[PDB]
Amino acid sequence: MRGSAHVVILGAGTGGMPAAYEMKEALGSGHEVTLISANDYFQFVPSNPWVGVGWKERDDIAFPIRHYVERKGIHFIAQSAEQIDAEAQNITLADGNTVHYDYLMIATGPKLAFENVPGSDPHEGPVQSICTVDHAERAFAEYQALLREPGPIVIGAMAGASCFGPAYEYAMIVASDLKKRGMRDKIPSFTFITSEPYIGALGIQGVGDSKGILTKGLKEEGIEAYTNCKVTKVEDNKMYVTQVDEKGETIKEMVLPVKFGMMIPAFKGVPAVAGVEGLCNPGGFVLVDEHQRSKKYANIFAAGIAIAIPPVETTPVPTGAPKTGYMIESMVSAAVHNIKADLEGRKGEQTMGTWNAVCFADMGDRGAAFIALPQLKPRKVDVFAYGRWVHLAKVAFEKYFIRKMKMGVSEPFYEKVLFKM
Amino acid sequence: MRGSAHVVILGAGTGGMPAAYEMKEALGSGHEVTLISANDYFQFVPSNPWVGVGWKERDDIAFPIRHYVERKGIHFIAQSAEQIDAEAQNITLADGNTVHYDYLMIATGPKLAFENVPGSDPHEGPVQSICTVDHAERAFAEYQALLREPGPIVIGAMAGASCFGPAYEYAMIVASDLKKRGMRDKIPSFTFITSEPYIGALGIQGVGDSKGILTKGLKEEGIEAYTNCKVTKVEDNKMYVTQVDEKGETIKEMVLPVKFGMMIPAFKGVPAVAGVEGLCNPGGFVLVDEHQRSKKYANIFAAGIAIAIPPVETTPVPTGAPKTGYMIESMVSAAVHNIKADLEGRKGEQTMGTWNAVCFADMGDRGAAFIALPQLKPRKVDVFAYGRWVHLAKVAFEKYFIRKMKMGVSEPFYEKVLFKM
Numbered sequence A, B: 001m002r003g004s005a006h007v008v009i010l011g012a013g014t015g016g017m018p019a020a021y022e023m024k025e026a027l028g029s030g031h032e033v034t035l036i037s038a039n040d041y042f043q044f045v046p047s048n049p050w051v052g053v054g055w056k057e058r059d060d061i062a063f064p065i066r067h068y069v070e071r072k073g074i075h076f077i078a079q080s081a082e083q084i085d086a087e088a089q090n091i092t093l094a095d096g097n098t099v100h101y102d103y104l105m106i107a108t109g110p111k112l113a114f115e116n117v118p119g120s121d122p123h124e125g126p127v128q129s130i131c132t133v134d135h136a137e138r139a140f141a142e143y144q145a146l147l148r149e150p151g152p153i154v155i156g157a158m159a160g161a162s163c164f165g166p167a168y169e170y171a172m173i174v175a176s177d178l179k180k181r182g183m184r185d186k187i188p189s190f191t192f193i194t195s196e197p198y199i200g201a202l203g204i205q206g207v208g209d210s211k212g213i214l215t216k217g218l219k220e221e222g223i224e225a226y227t228n229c230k231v232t233k234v235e236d237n238k239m240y241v242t243q244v245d246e247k248g249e250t251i252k253e254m255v256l257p258v259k260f261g262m263m264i265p266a267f268k269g270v271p272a273v274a275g276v277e278g279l280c281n282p283g284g285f286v287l288v289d290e291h292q293r294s295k296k297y298a299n300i301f302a303a304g305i306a307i308a309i310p311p312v313e314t315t316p317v318p319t320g321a322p323k324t325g326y327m328i329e330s331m332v333s334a335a336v337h338n339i340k341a342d343l344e345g346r347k348g349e350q351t352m353g354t355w356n357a358v359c360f361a362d363m364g365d366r367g368a369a370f371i372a373l374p375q376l377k378p379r380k381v382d383v384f385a386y387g388r389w390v391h392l393a394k395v396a397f398e399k400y401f402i403r404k405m406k407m408g409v410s411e412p413f414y415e416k417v418l419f420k421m
């Protein structure tokens, strides 16, 4: 309302949860902050692959949101938005109720575009997903069924995927778990299928020796790897794969039987957001400026996977660059800062800063991680790390982030670089 | 004088030059700041190996100090201190003149302890040094003499050395330059001799895959490598080497003819500092507390290679951990802050922060670099990088640091991490 702006955060994920806390902290008691999300629980998504192989469980990585945000004076509505009317500034929820906003911050993350590959939906066939805890649990269930009746395994990443690390991680921990159960020899074939132009390209033209290290990794586990692939369909428990060369010319088609599979899907924007006229690009990602403000609606901001970021390269099979946590948090920070500025008469000048990608993968005893920035080469930082210390770092960070999500954020969040001072 | 403390910085190196600027900035016009150093010029020491192979020249990496510090109101005396009387607080210069201080900040760096290995002094035989520009020029001169009359090459690091990166860098660029001149095949043998327990230990138990990468590097250049070595003497143009196993038992002695050689020497504290009663450990390194304050004299502080840092491991042949630039600068910052606090009645609480090592080596087209912290494993960061981007980074940093040394520092110096914002 006038004099007392009502700010709505859509989506309680890696960007949205911090956003709700940071917004309430920035605005204070004279403004209503409302968090709206499709689930009543937060989940730490980097841990989903471990759930998918049975090394973690839901209770380890997920917790109900309501109590934690509400003790901070944030209103919480555990309902999916089905429609957004940007003219009236009304959000229609799944139950038919509608919520008005003065400012809207979209943090709705990815729509998992299984429809791109007919039959690839986890409820449609043997190719599963570890992108969410619901899917990871379903993946583990199918993994156990594999254990009862061993057959070919196929793991990898679809055309248009942008999040490749988890495919490599999952393949490695599946290989590892299989050996631990004394079952690895019962698997007739173990194949890795990716849209990357080469192993370890990772949607970012590689980082450090990611190519050499990931290639060696898969070879060590006896995993046969194919790049420049797209899957045209999953059908009759078979994966239909088309492989091209650099020039896009088909060099072979394959038909792979799949007893147990997991392919990272391509991401699009969620339908309620994509469905806002003039808001998004054709992929359904919010078109924003450097201040995280929508190009069309001055009072709509966005952060996280939901925003559109232009590609800097094009690969034989379409792939995308990932949007990762440190950069997501810089977007959230900018958006919060600039909404507050707006509320006080100014155009906020804060930006996301420099593009970067950071990822951590834990194989059990040892981890792998990378930092790349900026997006185009030659970079200012381009580093790949491996070792026990990396595993310890992931474990520590998960523990930290989950606690922060329960306790609340102020907060120039990454003061977790104080490990220097 | 009372009410107007006189602060003296001893040594105009990587720590001392920033220190003089930062001290004057912190204290202002009501206090005299005096910089005293053995040379009238600053040199960028990471570039010395390139001077040693003729890829850089003195004028590229060195410049006269006087004009630059004096325009900042800093007094400059281009004279070695020969004696320090900590009771009277008088420094006796080489010319007999004496300078009084109220606070003294020691930044005198290393004494190159050639005397540990009889015959190893650069003016005594064929084993040269690239630790200073004077030595690097002399090394290049001897390199050209090698070119006229090819013979065995021996490069590496003495027992007690703590700065290993430059030995690897120098060996690599020497190998590289030799091929460029079409002369590499004229060299009968090319040997790398180190006190490290293994190749790429680097006085810090390795970092990232430093062992694998450096081993492969030397092998590619046809350089034969020997670890766990100490040199007992250089004589008759031969290097006498003793090699032990893990337990310190001699497994062989070698006698290597040397036409052209370069061995990183062990570091001690400079004689004027070591000679202060109760100031230093037996190595001649200043015993300081966490605030960079001398344990004995409340008004003596120290930073850089000059301070004593306890070892965390012991290797078959004694080696030390390096003291590198980012940590040196944190020491300088702490010392400046705490001297100012003292001047204003308080005990400053600022510390060096977390131990870390950072190094950059440039091989011409591509660089190598590492970050390790803290000192003991498992670390929080333990990363090794290689590539063209690393070469570009070194070139950029050298250019930046030299400019800053001419323009002056305020300054939370490493805001050069703003490449993020």
Ligand SMILES: Cc1cc2nc3c(=O)[nH]c(=O)nc-3n(C[C@H](O)[C@H](O)[C@H](O)COP(=O)(O)OP(=O)(O)OC[C@H]3O[C@@H](n4cnc5c(N)ncnc54)[C@H](O)[C@@H]3O)c2cc1C
Binding pocket: A010, A011, A012, A013, A014, A015, A016, A036, A037, A038, A039, A045, A046, A047, A048, A049, A079, A080, A081, A082, A107, A108, A109, A110, A130, A131, A132, A163, A166, A270, A272, A273, A303, A304, A305, A306, A323, A324, A325, A326, A328, A358, A359, A360, A361
């Ligand atoms: C398996 C996997 C591993 C990853 N590992 C890393 C890593 O090691 N490091 C790193 O920095 N990044 C990692 N990421 C990438 C990234 O950081 C995450 O995907 C992160 O969760 C994205 O944050 P987000 O806020 O944009 O989207 P999300 O975290 O997916 O949150 C989006 C949210 O909004 C909701 N929502 C969607 N539609 C609606 C609607 N119509 N109405 C209401 N709510 C809605 C969701 O239910 C959800 O809570 C990983 C991603 C995956 C899939």
Ligand SMILES: Cc1cc2nc3c(=O)[nH]c(=O)nc-3n(C[C@H](O)[C@H](O)[C@H](O)COP(=O)(O)OP(=O)(O)OC[C@H]3O[C@@H](n4cnc5c(N)ncnc54)[C@H](O)[C@@H]3O)c2cc1C
Binding pocket: B010, B011, B012, B013, B014, B015, B016, B036, B037, B038, B039, B045, B046, B047, B048, B049, B079, B080, B081, B082, B107, B108, B109, B110, B130, B131, B132, B163, B166, B270, B272, B273, B303, B304, B305, B306, B323, B324, B325, B326, B328, B358, B359, B360, B361
């Ligand atoms: C070949 C080489 C390569 C290196 N590369 C790197 C790198 O890539 N990254 C990194 O972080 N570090 C690097 N270092 C390590 C380190 O950072 C440097 O050695 C650095 O110069 C040390 O700073 P300092 O102020 O302690 O000593 P120095 O820079 O040696 O300065 C000491 C100074 O005080 C003086 N002095 C000595 N005695 C007296 C006296 N009695 N009276 C007056 N003045 C005196 C000197 O003449 C000199 O100016 C390298 C070192 C070497 C030798």
Ligand SMILES: CCCCCCCCCCCCO[C@@H]1O[C@H](CO)[C@@H](O[C@H]2O[C@H](CO)[C@@H](O)[C@H](O)[C@H]2O)[C@H](O)[C@H]1O
Binding pocket: A164, A165, A166, A168, A169, A172, A213, A214, A216, A217, A218, A359, A360, A361, A368, A369, A370, A385, A386, A387, B208, B209, B212
């Ligand atoms: C987070 C994003 C990244 C993608 C997800 C994960 C990818 C899968 C990881 C495969 C790694 C397997 O292969 C592993 O790699 C490294 C090579 O650097 C080797 O390790 C080597 O370098 C490391 C340091 O980095 C040293 O500590 C080690 O002593 C050395 O042998 C391991 O001996 C090998 O077992």
Ligand SMILES: CCCCCCCCCCCCO[C@@H]1O[C@H](CO)[C@@H](O[C@H]2O[C@H](CO)[C@@H](O)[C@H](O)[C@H]2O)[C@H](O)[C@H]1O
Binding pocket: A208, A209, A212, B164, B165, B166, B168, B169, B172, B213, B214, B216, B217, B218, B359, B360, B361, B368, B369, B370, B385, B386, B387
């Ligand atoms: C600064 C402190 C370090 C010590 C000083 C310098 C040590 C000497 C460097 C020797 C390196 C030589 O060997 C070189 O190493 C790397 C291995 O990671 C290889 O490079 C490999 O990883 C890099 C990324 O890190 C990739 O970009 C590259 O495509 C891949 O092949 C090079 O193909 C090889 O030529």
Ligand SMILES: CCCCCCCCCCC1=C(C)C(=O)C(OC)=C(OC)C1=O
Binding pocket: A014, A046, A324, A325, A326, A327, A356, A358, A359, A360, A371, A381, A394, A397, A398, B420
């Ligand atoms: C120098 C520029 C890069 C700074 C990044 C520092 C690394 C800190 C942890 C990285 C991380 C982030 C940010 C993160 O958001 C995240 O969750 C999605 C992780 O997974 C466990 C991470 O490992």
Ligand SMILES: CCCCCCCCCCC1=C(C)C(=O)C(OC)=C(OC)C1=O
Binding pocket: A420, B014, B046, B324, B325, B326, B327, B356, B358, B359, B360, B371, B381, B394, B397, B398
């Ligand atoms: C995360 C903790 C480590 C931070 C270090 C950031 C790297 C910036 C440059 C490093 C560097 C420093 C500090 C430095 O002082 C120095 O000169 C001795 C270099 O040689 C060229 C360097 O490459």
Ligand SMILES: [S]
Binding pocket: A162, A163, A164, A165, A166, A202, A322, A359
């Ligand atoms: S990734």
Ligand SMILES: [S]
Binding pocket: A205
């Ligand atoms: S590439």
Ligand SMILES: [S]
Binding pocket: A165, A322, A324, A358, A359, A360
């Ligand atoms: S990631």
Ligand SMILES: [S]
Binding pocket: B162, B163, B164, B165, B166, B202, B322, B359
């Ligand atoms: S080093």
Ligand SMILES: [S]
Binding pocket: B205
């Ligand atoms: S070690």
Ligand SMILES: [S]
Binding pocket: B165, B322, B324, B358, B359, B360
């Ligand atoms: S270094």
